[PDB]
Every structure is written in structure tokens, then in C-alpha cells.
Design an enzyme around this catalytic site. Structure first.
Site, short mmCIF file in Angstrom:
data_model
loop_
_atom_site.label_atom_id
_atom_site.label_comp_id
_atom_site.label_asym_id
_atom_site.label_seq_id
_atom_site.Cartn_x
_atom_site.Cartn_y
_atom_site.Cartn_z
N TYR A 89 8.05 -4.31 4.53
CA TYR A 89 7.76 -4.11 3.10
C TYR A 89 8.27 -2.75 2.59
O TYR A 89 8.92 -2.69 1.53
CB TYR A 89 6.26 -4.30 2.83
CG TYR A 89 5.89 -3.90 1.43
CD1 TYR A 89 5.99 -4.81 0.35
CD2 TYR A 89 5.41 -2.60 1.16
CE1 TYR A 89 5.65 -4.44 -0.93
CE2 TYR A 89 5.09 -2.19 -0.13
CZ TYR A 89 5.23 -3.10 -1.17
OH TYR A 89 4.90 -2.75 -2.45
N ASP A 99 -2.55 -2.01 -8.17
CA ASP A 99 -1.67 -0.85 -7.98
C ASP A 99 -1.54 -0.09 -9.30
O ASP A 99 -0.84 -0.55 -10.22
CB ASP A 99 -0.31 -1.32 -7.49
CG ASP A 99 0.60 -0.16 -7.12
OD1 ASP A 99 1.58 -0.38 -6.39
OD2 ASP A 99 0.37 0.97 -7.57
N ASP A 139 2.26 10.24 -3.06
CA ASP A 139 1.69 9.82 -1.79
C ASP A 139 0.78 8.64 -2.02
O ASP A 139 -0.13 8.69 -2.88
CB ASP A 139 0.90 10.98 -1.19
CG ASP A 139 1.80 12.15 -0.83
OD1 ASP A 139 2.85 11.90 -0.17
OD2 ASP A 139 1.45 13.29 -1.16
N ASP A 141 -1.11 1.92 1.19
CA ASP A 141 -1.31 0.50 0.82
C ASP A 141 -2.19 -0.18 1.86
O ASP A 141 -2.00 0.02 3.09
CB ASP A 141 0.01 -0.28 0.81
CG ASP A 141 0.82 -0.06 -0.42
OD1 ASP A 141 0.36 0.64 -1.37
OD2 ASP A 141 1.96 -0.66 -0.43
#
Lengths: 123, 125
Positions: free
Chosen positions: A14, A38, A96, A99
Site C-alpha cells: 500500500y 482519514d 507523519d 495507518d
């Protein structure tokens, strides 16, 4: 359901796809019913067209790289730290992010949660 | 409910407490009815009694160090995630484990949930 090693591979893949900017290949990694939060704290995005639109907006000179190992579980989930480099109106920026991902029994992303806020952003 | 900056400070504080091994101070950071999943994928432990028992078994034998290996990522809804490394001994052998904790805080600044992502892939002797 992907093993811990397989989760490490998929999560690193990913990041490699984000880094090259291949929106099609990124969206293929997601399941039909996937959600993307997100930054985490924002409403979830769902719908394949909607997830594609998100990546096109975000990626449509962005680079991204792991800044530590993928942490993977035995239940198809993992978490990874990385740094994104982008240009804002000609200005280099970095962000920064961590996930957290859950994969389904077909190895596709079921949930993506991207932790970051302005405290994580530099110029 | 902690702000992003406050989440960064609380989560960093947490690592400081793990590093020194202050079990009581760790347990006081948790909500009285908090849940811990550590490693994520194992059944949740519930409540300060069970959480104290968990930290006592993990830390009460001394020799644990822990340090952030990157910045705390914080949200605007009282949550955050951080990467860190724990150094431990296994019957005299030095061990290390890379972990990411995700935490959600309550409206009183206590940890309501913690999820610790790691498996044996992250463990090195």
C-alpha cells in the site's frame, strides 16, 4: 484472512503504491464495503467511486515511506508509521501518519484509519 | 476530552510510566472501566483490577524499558496512535518488541480503550 506476514506485505505494498501515485492500483486493494477515515475523527468515506475520488484529490508529487516496521496482528489487522512528503503550492511539506488497517478473508482492505493532525505536519 | 496536543502529552506520559515501571500510575491513567487489547486480536481485558494485573505481570519483574520511536499521531476526537519499542529480558536474554498503541480517551482525560498492535514478527532477541 491474511497471516501476520501477509499483513506486513500488503501494508508495505500500500505505501509503495501511494509513493508511486497509482490510484487505480490503490483502489483495487480495497473491498467493496470498505471505509476510509482519514484523518481519523472525520466521517468515514465509503463507496468505490468515493474512495477513488479521495485518492485522486490527495495524489492527483506526493511521496510516502515507512518510518518503522509494520506491526501486524493474527486477526488480519496491522498498524504502520510513515511520512508523507508533499508540495503545497510549490512548498515542500511533510506529514507523519499512522495507518491502522483491517483486511478481509480475501486479502482486501475492509477498514483504513489514518491517524494524524496538524501537530504532525511540518513545512 | 483531550485536544490533539493534550493527547500527544498523555500518550508520551504513558510511555514514560511503562519505562519506569510505575504500575499504579499506569492504571490511574485508565478509565475505571477501560478496555485493553494487547496484543490486538486477543480478548479485551476490562476494568482497572484486570488492567493492573496485566501491567503487574508485564512490568512487576523489572528490567522493562520503553521509548517512542516516532511522534505521537493525535486526532481531534480525543484519540491517538504511537510507535514505540520495548526492551525486556527473557530469563537473562535481552529482547525487544516494536509496538503501535492506539488509544481513545474519555471526556475526563482518561484512557477508555487501548489497542496494542504487534505480533511475534515484531519481536527480536
Amino acid at each position: 484472512l491474511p497471516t501476520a506476514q501477509e499483513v506486513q506485505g500488503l501494508m508495505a505494498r500500500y505505501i509503495e503504491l501511494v509513493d508511486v501515485g497509482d490510484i487505480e492500483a490503490i483502489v483495487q486493494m480495497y473491498a467493496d464495503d470498505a471505509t476510509v477515515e482519514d484523518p481519523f475523527g472525520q466521517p468515514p468515506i465509503h463507496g468505490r467511486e468515493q474512495i477513488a475520488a479521495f485518492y485522486r484529490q490527495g495524489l492527483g508529487k506526493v511521496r510516502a515511506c515507512l518510518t518503522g516496521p509494520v506491526r501486524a496482528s493474527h486477526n488480519g489487522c496491522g498498524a504502520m508509521p510513515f511520512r508523507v512528503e508533499m508540495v503545497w503550492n510549490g512548498q515542500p511539506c511533510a506529514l507523519d501518519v499512522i495507518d491502522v488497517m483491517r483486511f478481509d478473508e480475501h486479502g482486501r482492505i475492509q477498514t483504513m484509519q489514518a491517524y494524524w493532525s496538524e501537530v504532525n505536519l511540518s513545512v
